[PDB]
């Protein structure tokens, strides 16, 4: 996860495809497998408010069947890039506020000739494996990219506290990306249905007959959302004994200070969720047993959490021991709801009693973890500025705040 390129793809998403479903690249380390034809798997726990939604495979639509001259390509213009962002390479010495786009597609003609012309191998053993698992497979029917190369770069309390980036994007480098779901038939039959339901899936549901002498297998995104998202996971979250919130608060305590081995929960967990395998986690508290919905919550808010700086995750740490976590929440929870779907930058008053029971050390705390969110908090209005642009960092850490407080409450 690149925090500048997320921050350019994100604006981007938000430009082009307003209120759509066009999704925003989080990293380009692997971008080539987001172009067309390409299959992607839904991100387990994953949401539309930060991270990535998709997640890559080894294989494209074609390498599942028994390039260029089968893609549209279509100029598109200019996308502005966060107020927070420069842009070299376009401009000369000096800088710009625009990138260059173009978009590739599948063309329709291509899309129906390979339904009329080729099944899906019944011998591939991705595909086989995927439908043993019943798990939806998507295909990249539409990619935007840079039409350039372009390098990008982002532009008081942390010195206090004793406490405290650039990216070539090449050209061709796939910036968003569309997905439709691939659904299979008998006979490995095909199609990728226009209009994508939520209620489809890839495969059929396929059983061995009960009782049977033969083995043979037969036949939005606005605050409001946001806000029930999170509270679906607090919710799975708050089933445990108050000894096993305790424990795993420990644990997520020694994790906080250290972002690499938080990560690595976090893989190693998507991992073990994801394949199904048994949960044998060292990180994981000892003496609560964790069923799976209480396991996949722990992700969510571990893929919340890693969204978030080093720093911002040892404040985190100090303001549970100063117990000024329900005030910060309250503060960042307020903002977002006030302007969550603010398009512009603003400058706003914040309520007085927001801030008004912090001491220095805790004010500070917190003005540190609110503006390393892109929330600048100024205390002697009290005023803040709102950046739409950086939204997604502050809705992850409303996730992160909401665990944490209930596991402190």
């Not at 960042?332 to 029971?357: C, W």
């Amino acid at each position: 996860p690149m925090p500048v390129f997320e921050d350019v793809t994100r604006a981007l998403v938000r430009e082009l495809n307003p209120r759509g479903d066009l999704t925003p690249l989080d990293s380009l380390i692997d971008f080539k497998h987001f172009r067309p034809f390409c299959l992607v798997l839904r991100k387990r726990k994953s949401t539309l408010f930060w991270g990535a939604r998709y997640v890559r495979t080894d294989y494209t639509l074609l390498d599942l069947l028994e390039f260029k001259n089968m893609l549209d390509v279509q100029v598109q213009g200019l996308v502005e890039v966060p107020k927070t962002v420069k842009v070299k390479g376009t401009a000369g010495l000096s800088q710009s506020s625009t990138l260059e786009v173009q978009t590739l597609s599948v063309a329709p003609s291509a899309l129906e000739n390979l339904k009329k012309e080729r099944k899906l191998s019944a011998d591939h053993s991705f595909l086989n494996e995927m439908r043993y698992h019943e798990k939806n497979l998507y295909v990249v029917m539409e990619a935007v990219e840079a039409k350039q190369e372009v390098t990008v770069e982002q532009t008081p309390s942390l010195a206090l506290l004793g406490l405290q980036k650039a990216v070539t994007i090449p050209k061709g480098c796939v910036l968003a990306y569309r997905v439709r779901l691939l659904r299979v038939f008998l006979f490995n039959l095909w199609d990728i249905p226009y209009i994508c339901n939520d209620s489809m899936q890839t495969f059929p549901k396929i059983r061995r007959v009960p009782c049977s002498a033969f083995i043979s297998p037969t036949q939005h995104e606005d605050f409001k959302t946001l806000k029930e998202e999170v509270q679906r996971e607090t919710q799975e979250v708050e089933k445990l004994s108050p000894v096993g919130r305790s424990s795993l608060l420990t644990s997520l305590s020694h994790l906080l200070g250290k972002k690499k081995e938080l990560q690595d929960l976090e893989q190693k967990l998507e991992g073990a969720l994801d394949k199904g395998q048994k949960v044998t986690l060292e990180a994981l508290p000892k003496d609560v047993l964790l069923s799976k919905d209480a396991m996949d919550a722990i992700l969510y808010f571990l893929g919340a959490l890693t969204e978030l700086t080093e720093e911002q995750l040892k404040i985190l740490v100090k303001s549970l021991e100063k117990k000024i976590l329900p005030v910060q929440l309250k503060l960042v929870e307020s903002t977002l709801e006030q302007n969550f779907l603010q398009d512009k930058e603003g400058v706003f008053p914040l309520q007085p009693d927001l801030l008004s029971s912090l001491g220095e050390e805790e004010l500070t705390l917190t003005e540190a973890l609110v503006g390393l969110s892109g929330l600048e908090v100024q205390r002697s209005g009290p005023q803040y500025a709102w950046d739409p642009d950086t939204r997604h960092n502050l809705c992850a850490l409303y996730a992160g705040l909401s665990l944490l407080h209930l596991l402190s409450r």
